[PDB]
Design an enzyme around this catalytic site. Structure first.
Site, mmCIF file in Angstrom:
data_model
loop_
_atom_site.group_PDB
_atom_site.id
_atom_site.type_symbol
_atom_site.label_atom_id
_atom_site.label_comp_id
_atom_site.label_asym_id
_atom_site.label_seq_id
_atom_site.Cartn_x
_atom_site.Cartn_y
_atom_site.Cartn_z
ATOM 1 N N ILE A 103 0.548 -1.318 0.033
ATOM 2 C CA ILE A 103 0.024 0.273 0.009
ATOM 3 C C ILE A 103 1.195 1.129 -0.038
ATOM 4 O O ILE A 103 0.239 2.702 -0.446
ATOM 5 C CB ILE A 103 -0.698 0.129 1.450
ATOM 6 C CG1 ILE A 103 -0.495 0.490 2.481
ATOM 7 C CG2 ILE A 103 -1.984 -0.864 1.289
ATOM 8 C CD1 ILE A 103 -1.604 0.402 3.767
ATOM 9 N N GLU A 163 10.387 -1.542 8.811
ATOM 10 C CA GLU A 163 8.961 -1.357 9.517
ATOM 11 C C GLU A 163 8.114 -2.661 10.145
ATOM 12 O O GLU A 163 6.767 -2.498 10.833
ATOM 13 C CB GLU A 163 8.044 -0.275 8.251
ATOM 14 C CG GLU A 163 8.488 0.319 7.483
ATOM 15 C CD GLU A 163 8.407 1.027 6.152
ATOM 16 O OE1 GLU A 163 7.002 2.005 6.126
ATOM 17 O OE2 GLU A 163 8.716 0.210 5.818
ATOM 18 N N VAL A 164 8.608 -3.912 9.352
ATOM 19 C CA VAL A 164 7.449 -4.917 9.718
ATOM 20 C C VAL A 164 8.592 -6.446 9.885
ATOM 21 O O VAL A 164 9.144 -6.607 9.246
ATOM 22 C CB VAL A 164 6.605 -5.513 8.048
ATOM 23 C CG1 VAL A 164 5.774 -6.470 9.072
ATOM 24 C CG2 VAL A 164 5.506 -3.803 8.193
ATOM 25 N N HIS A 202 10.249 -10.249 4.006
ATOM 26 C CA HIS A 202 9.588 -9.528 2.785
ATOM 27 C C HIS A 202 11.015 -9.131 2.300
ATOM 28 O O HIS A 202 11.044 -7.893 2.563
ATOM 29 C CB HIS A 202 8.408 -9.031 3.321
ATOM 30 C CG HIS A 202 8.317 -7.038 3.446
ATOM 31 N ND1 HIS A 202 9.196 -7.260 5.501
ATOM 32 C CD2 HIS A 202 8.273 -6.107 3.554
ATOM 33 C CE1 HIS A 202 9.048 -6.219 6.604
ATOM 34 N NE2 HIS A 202 9.164 -5.260 4.779
ATOM 35 N N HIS A 235 11.499 -6.252 -0.677
ATOM 36 C CA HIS A 235 10.701 -5.496 -1.750
ATOM 37 C C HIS A 235 11.304 -5.867 -3.112
ATOM 38 O O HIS A 235 12.392 -5.790 -3.732
ATOM 39 C CB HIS A 235 10.665 -4.220 -1.781
ATOM 40 C CG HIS A 235 10.241 -3.741 -0.554
ATOM 41 N ND1 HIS A 235 9.375 -3.315 0.219
ATOM 42 C CD2 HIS A 235 11.314 -4.089 0.635
ATOM 43 C CE1 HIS A 235 8.895 -2.602 1.204
ATOM 44 N NE2 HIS A 235 10.447 -3.025 1.819
#
Lengths: 136, 136
Positions: A32, A90-91, A95, A97
């Site tokens: 997002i 951030e998380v 993950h 990108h």
């Protein structure tokens, strides 16, 4: 409200996500906060974190799917190259990108789109899925 | 004096380089334009480019060394996390950027140190090499 809480809900299917890829071990879905249109997160289904310390087999599976996504975003968005970033600040769920790139300025977190339109996201999803179908 | 020219000189040992790792297939050395101190480039010896298109044997060797370097920079500079970037817009030979990180702002090309001190580079090479021996 946080990027981490929304991320968690998307992977747990407690909020809608725009997925582009799923296998037994790895999923990919649109961020997002895209750096460029088509910015995809490639994510192991298991909760692991800290890329450099994860098992090589697990990391290589994740990076293998990132290659497929990188090929797809180049095709879908007509770019010669794809950018890839692992950050994790951030998380705290590993993950990768992966996004199509045109300039060095694409890289980094200052100038992400904090409000991408639903059609832009719909379109990125559909184009990546079509590209993946052509590659399969 | 292009980045591509300088990278080639360093790989070929025509300009001095601060190497931290060498095997039969992959080398790693400090970049001349670090995003943070300890920023290392992991480079296959083979003339290949375009990460998403690289065969899995070759790609997975580069990934393995990238993890090792990531562990070493985290240990050497006492950071929880390391960043990883693949971009390729400056130098057309596959190379993975691996650097210790504390902030999202570290990511990206807008404020690299374009002329880091010989002292900062020397200490970074020393500390990374010590960490690698410690992890071996």
């Amino acid at each position: 409200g946080s990027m981490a809480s929304i991320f968690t809900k998307i992977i747990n299917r407690e909020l809608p996500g725009r997925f582009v890829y799923e296998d037994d071990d790895v999923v990919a879905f649109l961020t997002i906060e895209p750096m460029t249109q088509g910015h995809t997160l490639v994510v192991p289904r298991e909760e692991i974190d800290n890329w450099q310390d994860v098992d090589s087999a697990a990391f290589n599976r994740v990076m293998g799917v990132s290659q497929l996504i990188g090929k797809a975003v180049c095709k879908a968005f007509r770019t010669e190259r794809s950018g890839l970033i692992i950050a994790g600040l951030e998380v705290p769920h590993l993950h990768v990108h992966v996004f199509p790139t045109r300039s060095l300025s694409d890289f980094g977190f200052a100038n992400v789109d904090r409000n991408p339109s639903p059609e832009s996201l719909d379109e990125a999803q559909a184009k990546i899925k079509a590209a993946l179908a052509q590659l399969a």
